[PDB]
Please model this.
Amino acid sequence: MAVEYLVDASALYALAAHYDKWIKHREKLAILHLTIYEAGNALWKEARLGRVDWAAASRHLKKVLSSFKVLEDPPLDEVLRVAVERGLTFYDASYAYVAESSGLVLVTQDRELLAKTKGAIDVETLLVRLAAQ
Amino acid sequence: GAMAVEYLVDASALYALAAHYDKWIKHREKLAILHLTIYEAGNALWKEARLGRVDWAAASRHLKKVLSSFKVLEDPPLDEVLRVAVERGLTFYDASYAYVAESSGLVLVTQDRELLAKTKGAIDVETLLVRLAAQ
Amino acid sequence: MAVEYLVDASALYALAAHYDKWIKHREKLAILHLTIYEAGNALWKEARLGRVDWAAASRHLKKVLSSFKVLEDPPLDEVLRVAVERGLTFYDASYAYVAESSGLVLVTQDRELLAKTKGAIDVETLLVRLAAQ
Amino acid sequence: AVEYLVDASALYALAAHYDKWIKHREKLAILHLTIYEAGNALWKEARLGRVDWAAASRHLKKVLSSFKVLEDPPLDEVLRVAVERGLTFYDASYAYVAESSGLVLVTQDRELLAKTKGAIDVETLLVRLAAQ
Ligand SMILES: [Cl-]
Ligand SMILES: [Cl-]
Model:
C-alpha cells in the first residue's frame, strides 16, 4: 500500500509486456487520467498503420491500465509553468510536476523527461528496484 | 455521479466558451468535460505561450477557473473508444468524446467540423449558446 | 515519366527493411519533400524513447531516402481542398493529391489513406507487384 | 542573396505583413517543410470552423511562393541537432539549416529562439528590414 511511482504512457506501454514482474507490486504504482488516453492514442496509431490484433491488444492494454492507481489532476496553472520553464510539452510537464511535487519517482521511457525530472528512472530501472523486494 | 448533465464539452468548445462565461455560467450544472479535456485545453494554451503569448500565466489562471466550473465524467473503456476511433476514422482523443456523448445520451459540444459530422446530435458552441439563452 | 509509385512516410519506413527487394526498381519510386522530414521525425521519436542505435540507423535512412526521386511540391490550395473533403490531415492529403494528380499509385501503410486514395496500396502489395518484373 | 530562414510560425505571421517584406523577399527563404507546416495550420483552422479557408489558402499560396526554397538537410545531421538540443526533428531542421548556412533563423517559437545561435522573431526581423 502507498504509492511510490508515477508511470507515464511510454512506461506503461513498455510495462504491459512484463505484467507478471510487477502486478504483485501494483500498490506502489500510479498513473494520471491522461495516461489512459495517451496509451489509447498510441495503440490507435498502430491500428492505423496495420496492426491486425488491435482489438485483442486493446483489451490487454485495458487490463494493464486497470492495475494502476489513478492520481488527481494537477492544476493546469502549475503544469503550464513547468512546461514553459523546462521546455517540455504540457503533456510531459504534467508528469514531471505531479512526480516532483508529490515526492514520487517518475517512471518514463522518454529521454527528455528522465533528464528534466528529478528522480526519474526508466522501466528497466523500475524492474530491478521491484525485484529487490 | 451527477445527472443534471445534458452536454459533453470538448477542448475546442471549452476554449471558445472561455470567452463567454456569462452566457453559460448559470447553466454549468448542465455541462461536463472528460479528464482528457483538462490536458487538451492546457496543451493548447501551451502552444500559444510557445509562440509568444505574453499573458500565458494570467490566461492559465483564467482557463483554470473556467475548467473548475464543469462536472467531470469518468474515463471511458479504452477498447470501446478504440473501436469508435477505427470505425469512424477519428483520433483516439476525438473518439473518446463521440463515445461518451453517444453512450450517455449527451449532446457533444465541439468546434471540430469532423466531430460534428461523425457524432450524432453534436452541436457547436453557437448552437449551444442559443439553446441556453432559451431556458 | 518512368516513376510509377509515390511512397509516403509509413511506406518508406517499412521499405527500409527490404532494401534489396525494391532497390532495382527505384527509378519507378518517388517521394515528396515532406517525406524526408516525416521519416526523420519517426526516427527521432524512437531515439527520444531510448533507441540506442539511432546514430547508425539515421545513416541507413539517409541512404534509403537517397534512392528515391523527389517530386515537386503540390499547390497548397489543392491539397487543402482534398484534406477538407476527405477528412485527412494536410500531410496525408498531400500524398493523396499528388499520387492521384500525377497518375501514380500511392504506397501507404495507413489504412485511412488506402481507403481514401484511389489506387493506393500497401508495402506488401507493392513488393508482390515488383516481384512480377 | 538569402540572409533569413523563415519557419512556419514566422511565415504564418508574416503573411499578415505582406507589404513590410516583399521588396525584401530575395533575402527570405524557407524549407520545403514550411509549405506542409503552413498548410497544416490552415487545415486546423478550417477544421475548427474557419469559413474563408479556401480564400485564405490562396493568399497563403502567394505568400509562400515569394520565398526561395533551400535544399533539404541531411536527415543525418538534423537528427543529431534535435537529440542534443531537445528539439523535435522539424524544429531542429530549421536550427541546422540556418546555422550550417550562416543564416538568421526567424521563428515565432520561444524554444527555437533560445536554441539557435542568432535566431530572432518576426518583430525583430521587421525592425531590421525597416532600417535597410
Ligand atoms: Cl519539446
Ligand atoms: Cl483525422
About this structure: Helices of chain C lie at 9-15, 19-22, 33-48, 54-66, 76-86, 90-102, 111-116, 123-131.
